[PDB]
Design an enzyme around this catalytic site. Structure first.
Site, PDB file in Angstrom:
ATOM      1  CB  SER A   1      -0.996  -0.125   1.156  1.00 17.27           C
ATOM      2  OG  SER A   1      -1.985   0.898   1.061  1.00 17.27           O
TER       3      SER A   1
ATOM      4  CG  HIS B   1      -5.651  -2.945   1.144  1.00 18.13           C
ATOM      5  ND1 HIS B   1      -4.966  -2.664  -0.021  1.00 18.13           N
ATOM      6  CD2 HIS B   1      -5.103  -2.161   2.104  1.00 18.13           C
ATOM      7  CE1 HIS B   1      -4.049  -1.741   0.222  1.00 18.13           C
ATOM      8  NE2 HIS B   1      -4.105  -1.425   1.507  1.00 18.13           N
TER       9      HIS B   1
ATOM     10  CD  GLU C   1      -5.562  -4.384  -3.422  1.00 16.83           C
ATOM     11  OE1 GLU C   1      -5.571  -3.689  -2.379  1.00 16.83           O
ATOM     12  OE2 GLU C   1      -4.599  -5.111  -3.738  1.00 16.83           O
TER      13      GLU C   1
END
Ligand SMILES: NC(=O)c1cc[n+](COC[n+]2ccccc2/C=N/O)cc1
Ligand SMILES: NC(=O)c1cc[n+](COC[n+]2ccccc2/C=N/O)cc1
Ligand SMILES: *[C@@H]1O[C@H](CO)[C@@H](O)[C@H](O)[C@H]1NC(C)=O
Ligand SMILES: *[C@@H]1O[C@H](CO)[C@@H](O)[C@H](O)[C@H]1NC(C)=O
Ligand SMILES: *[C@@H]1O[C@H](CO)[C@@H](O)[C@H](O)[C@H]1NC(C)=O
Lengths: 533, 535
Positions: free
Chosen positions: B203, B440, B327
Site C-alpha cells: 500500500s 487489502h 482491494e
C-alpha cells in the site's frame, strides 16, 4: 373470366391474376391506385384519394417504382441489385398490391401490411423478397404492400409551408392504410385485424404510425424489424429539414412558395442528383430527406412520444439481425470492401468512428473508441473490423430497438423481441459481414419455400417456422402457437427480465438483456456526454 | 562483554550493538531491534529532514522494538483483531526513527541478499514492529537478511509548506532514504550484501518504494523493487504543492497557528493536537484519501509520478507488482453508509450512488455518472448484492488495481523487467466477514511466513502456500526472477509485457497464467476518466 380474379372496390372494378405458389394458386391484385398521381403541382403535397374509374382496371402487374436514387457501387452484383428498382421509375407511383388465398377466404382473414425500407430514399413494394404469395398460400393470410414516395418527393419539407409540409411519404402510407379499411373486406380481409410490419425505414414508419393518433384507428398490432422511429437517423428537426430543403433548392438553382414552385419545375433526376449533397457531415447510415418533427404528424420527437405514450392496448414484435452494421461500412468507410476481408488498422477504426457517429464531439468519439476497443488486442485488425461494424449496428439499430422495447413495455404494451442469427446459404456478400441487415426478410416472406431458389431443406423448415410466428402474431398478438405444447415458449419482453429469443436453425433459445451494458452507454451516457459536449 | 553470546555482538558506524537470539519454528535467528538511524526528530527538528544519528558510546541494547511514530489510532471496532493487528504495539513518540535487522543464526559467512520492508498505513499510520512484519521466518527459512525501518507519518512526516526551509515536505520519505543509506554502510556487518538490496512494501509502503524508483538520489541504494497493492501514481499517494500548502495552513488554523512563523507555531503544538485535527483538512468526504502524503515538490519528486513513469528509462530495473482479489472491501466500512463488518452490507441503488461520490471524491457529476453507468449491472440495476460488490470494485479498481495496471504497463514499455500477480487466497483465520473476500493487506502474513508458526492455527496447505510465496519473493530478491531454475516442472511465472499482459494467480493451486489486468475497466479509469473530468 375467372370470378375469383374479379373484385369491386369503392373506386370500381379490378381484375387480378392467378399466381402459382409451391403448394397451390394464389390471387394477386397488383398495381391498384390508391391516390391521384402526385405529379406536377402535387409534388411535395399530401396525397389525395384516387378518383373512381370506369370499366375493369387491370391489376395483374406491378406498377412503377417511386422516383429514387439507384445504387451503382457494385454494378450487376446480386447483393446490391436485389434492392434496386425492378420496374420503371416514375413520380406516378402511388399503387398498392394485395395477395389473398385462392379461392378467396370464406371468412374474414387477418391482414398483414408490409412497408418496405431503404432509408426513406429508396425501395419498392415490387421487390422479389417482398413477394406475398407464400404467406397467402401457406398461412391463408391477406397480404398488402404499398409504394410510398421516397427522397425529396416524399420527405422534402419547408415546415410551416402549405405546399411542402413534410412527411407526405408517411401520408401516402396512411392513405393506403385507409384504403385497406374501406376495401379489404372485398378480398376477404378482416379490417378489424390489421398488422403492420416493416424493416429498417419501413419499421421506423410503422413506429411513426404507432406514434401518430390519426394512424391508430387503422391497425391493431405492429412488427418493427431492424428499425425504430426513435434513434439518430429516422427523423430530423424542423430546423434541419428547412436547412436541407433550402440547400437543395440553392443547389438546383432555386417566400417558401416561390422556392417550392421553382423546385416543382425541376425534372426528377435533377433533384436526385443533389439529394446526397445536403448532409451536414461525411457519414453512413444517414439520409437527407426523412420524416420531420413537424408538430403535426409527429406532435413531438419520437423519444418524447415513446416516453409519455400510453400503449396499453398495443402488441409489438421487434427485433434485429446479428450483424446490423456490416453492410453499411462498404458505402463510405475507408478500408472496407465486399471484395476482401476488410482488415483495418487502428487509425482507420478511429476515422471509421467519426463517420459512423457523425454527430459526435471529439470526446464522444473517444468514449466510443475506448468502449469498443478490445484492450487485450487493441491493434488486432479482425477485432477492429468487427468493432466498427458493432458501433454502426448498435448506434443505429440495436440500441434504439432496446430502448423502444423497454419504453413500450414500461408503458403497458405487450412486446416480443428477437435476434435473427441465421446467415442465408445463398448470400453473396462476404463472410465477414456475418448475418447482414435486411437478410431476415426473405425467410419471413417464405422465399425458401420455392425450390427453384436453392435454399437448403433446413432453411425451408426454418422459413416455415418464421411464417408461423409472424402470422400467429398477426392473428392474436402472440407469436406462440395456440395449440402445440412442447416448448420453449417465446416470452414477452419486459423491463424487469428483458427476455428475447434467438431465431436460427435450432429451437428457440431465451436470452436476457439485448446488449444491456453497451446499450446503456448509447442510451444513457452518450446523451449526457454530448450535451456537456 | 564476557559471558554474552558471541554471535549477538556487532559494530556499526555509530557504535556497538547487542542483539537477541529469537526462536523460529525451524531454528534460531538473530534480531537487532530498535537501532537508531537518525537524531530524534523532536522539538525544533519537527517537520525537518532527518539528521544521521550521531555515534553512541558503550553497547547499545538492540533486543526490543523501539517507539512507534506518533499517529492516529483506529478505534472503529474496539478489541476486534481485524483492526487491532494494524494498531501501534509500542509507545507513540516523535522519537521513533529506529530500524530492525533479522539475520540467520549464526550470521551468514558470505554476503546475503537483503530485503528491506517499508510498511503501509496511508502515510498516516503503521510501524515496523507489528507481528505481520516479523522477519524471523524469512531469515530462518530462506536465509535472508531482512531490514525494516520506522519513518515519520501524518503531519510529522508529510506536512509541507512547499518552498520553505523549515517544512519542505516528504521528510518521511527522507527518513526511509536515510535507512537505505544506513543499510549501504552497515549491512555487511551482519552478513548482508549491500550490492543486492530489494525494497518491498505494501500500500503506502509500495507507493514509497515507487517513489524511490522515481527519485534519483535513492536509485543508488537498491537494485530491485516489489510493490504490493500500491503505486506512486494514482489518486491518493501524492498531492500537488498547492494542495499540500492549503492543507498545512488549514491545519495550522485548526490548532491556533510568513511560513517561518506558521511553522514555528506548529512546532510548539503537542503532537496529539496535530493528530486530533489531521483528518479535518480533506477537501471532500471520502475514503482511500489521506491528509498528509508525499508532495510533488520538484525536489524529491521532480514532477508528478504519472509524468515520471511516462518518460523514465527503467532498463536496469526488475520489479514485482500485484494486488489482492478484493482491494476495496475493507475501505467501505470506514465511511460509506450501508457498509459494516457486522452484516452482509446489501445496499440500495441510492446508497451506491452516494458511495461512488465518496469513493471518487474528485469526480464531477458527469464523471460520477460514468462510473455508476460502467459498474451498474443493467440486467439487475437494483440488486443489492451486485451493488455491494460493485461499490467494492469501484474503490479497489480506482485506488489500486488500475494504478498498478498503469504502472506495470509503463515500466514494461520503458525497459523494466516486470512480474505481476493477483493474490486470491483468503486466510482461514480471517476475522473480517466473507463478503469482504480477500481484503487489502491480507497477503502480507503469507509473504512473511507467519503460517509456519504452529500456534497461529493456519492450515497445513496454508503452511505450504506461505513457503511457496517466501520462495518467489526471495528468488526475486536474489536474481530478479521469481522462478526457481532448479525446478522446470512447476508452472513458470512469465514477465508482464505490453503485448501479452500476463500475470499469475497466487492461491493454493499451482500458478495459473492469466492475461490482461482488468483491461477493459482499467481503460476506463486510466484513459477515459482523465479526459472526462477536464471537460
Ligand atoms: C445502401 O442500400 C442498400 N439497401 C437499401 C435498401 C434496403 C436494403 C439495402 C441493403 N440491404 O442489405
Ligand atoms: C486502517 O488501516 C489498517 N491498515 C494499515 C496498513 C495496511 C493495512 C491496513 C488494514 N488492512 O486491512
Ligand atoms: C480492401 O479493399 C479496399 C477498397 O479497394 C482497400 O482500400 C483495402 O485496402 C482492402 N483491404 C484492406 C483493409 O487493406
Ligand atoms: C449493516 O450495518 C450498518 C451499521 O449498523 C447499517 O447502516 C446497515 O444498514 C446494515 N445493513 C443492513 C441491510 O442491515
Ligand atoms: C489456536 O487454536 C487454539 C485451540 O483452539 C486456541 O486455543 C487458540 O486461541 C488459537 N489461537 C489463535 C491465534 O486463534
Amino acid at each position: 373470366e375467372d370470378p375469383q380474379l374479379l373484385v369491386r372496390v369503392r373506386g370500381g372494378q379490378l381484375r387480378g391474376i392467378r399466381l402459382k405458389a409451391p403448394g397451390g394458386p394464389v390471387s394477386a391484385f397488383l398495381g391498384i391506385p390508391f391516390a391521384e398521381p402526385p405529379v406536377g403541382s402535387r409534388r411535395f403535397m399530401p396525397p389525395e384519394p384516387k378518383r373512381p374509374w370506369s370499366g375493369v382496371l387491370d391489376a395483374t402487374t406491378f406498377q412503377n417504382v417511386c422516383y429514387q436514387y439507384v445504387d451503382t457501387l457494385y454494378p450487376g452484383f446480386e447483393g446490391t441489385e436485389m434492392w434496386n428498382p425492378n420496374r420503371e421509375l416514375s413520380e406516378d407511383c402511388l399503387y398498392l398490391n394485395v395477395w389473398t388465398p385462392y379461392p378467396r377466404p370464406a371468412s374474414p382473414t387477418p391482414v398483414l401490411i408490409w412497408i418496405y425500407g431503404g432509408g426513406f430514399y429508396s425501395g419498392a413494394a415490387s421487390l422479389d423478397v417482398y413477394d406475398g404469395r407464400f404467406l397467402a398460400q401457406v398461412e391463408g393470410a391477406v397480404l398488402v404492400s404499398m409504394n410510398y414516395r421516397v427522397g425529396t418527393f416524399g420527405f422534402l419539407a419547408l415546415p410551416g409551408s402549405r405546399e411542402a409540409p413534410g412527411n407526405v411519404g408517411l401520408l401516402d402510407q396512411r392513405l393506403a392504410l385507409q384504403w385497406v379499411q374501406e376495401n379489404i373486406a372485398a378480398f376477404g380481409g378482416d379490417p378489424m385485424s390489421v398488422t403492420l410490419f416493416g424493416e429498417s425505414a419501413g419499421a421506423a414508419s410503422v413506429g411513426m404510425h404507432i406514434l401518430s393518433l390519426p394512424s391508430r384507428s387503422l391497425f391493431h398490432r405492429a412488427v418493427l424489424q431492424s428499425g425504430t422511429p426513435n434513434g439518430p437517423w429516422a427523423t430530423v428537426s424542423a430546423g434541419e429539414a428547412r436547412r436541407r430543403a433550402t440547400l437543395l433548392a440553392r443547389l438546383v438553382g432555386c417566400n417558401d412558395t416561390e422556392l417550392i414552385a421553382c423546385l416543382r419545375t425541376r425534372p426528377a433526376q435533377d433533384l436526385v442528383d443533389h439529394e446526397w449533397h445536403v448532409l451536414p457531415q461525411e457519414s453512413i447510415f444517414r439520409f437527407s430527406f426523412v420524416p420531420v418533427v413537424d408538430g403535426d404528424f409527429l406532435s413531438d420527437t419520437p423519444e418524447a412520444l415513446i416516453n409519455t405514450g400510453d400503449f396499453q392496448d398495443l402488441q409489438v414484435l421487434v427485433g434485429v439481425v446479428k450483424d446490423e452494421g456490416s453492410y453499411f461500412l462498404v458505402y463510405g468507410v475507408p478500408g472496407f470492401s465486399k471484395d476482401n476481408e476488410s482488415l483495418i488498422s487502428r487509425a482507420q477504426f478511429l476515422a471509421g468512428v467519426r463517420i459512423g457517429v457523425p454527430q459526435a464531439s471529439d470526446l464522444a468519439a473517444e468514449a466510443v473508441v475506448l468502449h469498443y476497443t478490445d484492450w487485450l488486442h487493441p491493434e488486432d485488425p479482425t477485432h477492429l473490423r468487427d468493432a466498427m461494424s458493432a458501433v454502426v449496428g448498435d448506434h443505429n439499430v440495436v440500441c434504439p430497438v432496446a430502448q423502444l422495447a423497454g419504453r413500450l413495455a414500461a408503458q403497458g404494451a405487450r412486446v416480443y423481441a428477437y435476434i435473427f442469427e441465421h446467415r442465408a446459404s445463398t448470400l453473396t456478400w462476404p463472410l465477414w459481414m456475418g448475418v447482414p441487415h435486411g437478410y431476415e426478410i426473405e425467410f419471413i416472406f417464405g422465399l425458401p419455400l420455392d425450390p427453384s431458389l436453392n435454399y437448403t431443406t433446413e432453411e425451408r423448415i426454418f422459413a416455415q417456422r418464421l411464417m408461423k410466428y409472424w402470422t400467429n402474431f398477426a392473428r392474436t398478438g402472440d407469436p406462440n402457437d395456440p395449440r402445440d405444447s412442447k416448448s420453449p415458449q417465446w416470452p414477452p419482453y419486459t423491463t424487469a427480465a428483458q427476455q428475447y429469443v434467438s431465431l436460427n436453425l435450432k429451437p428457440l433459445e431465451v436470452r436476457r438483456g439485448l446488449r444491456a451494458q453497451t446499450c446503456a452507454f448509447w442510451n444513457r451516457f452518450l446523451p449526457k456526454l454530448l450535451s456537456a459536449t
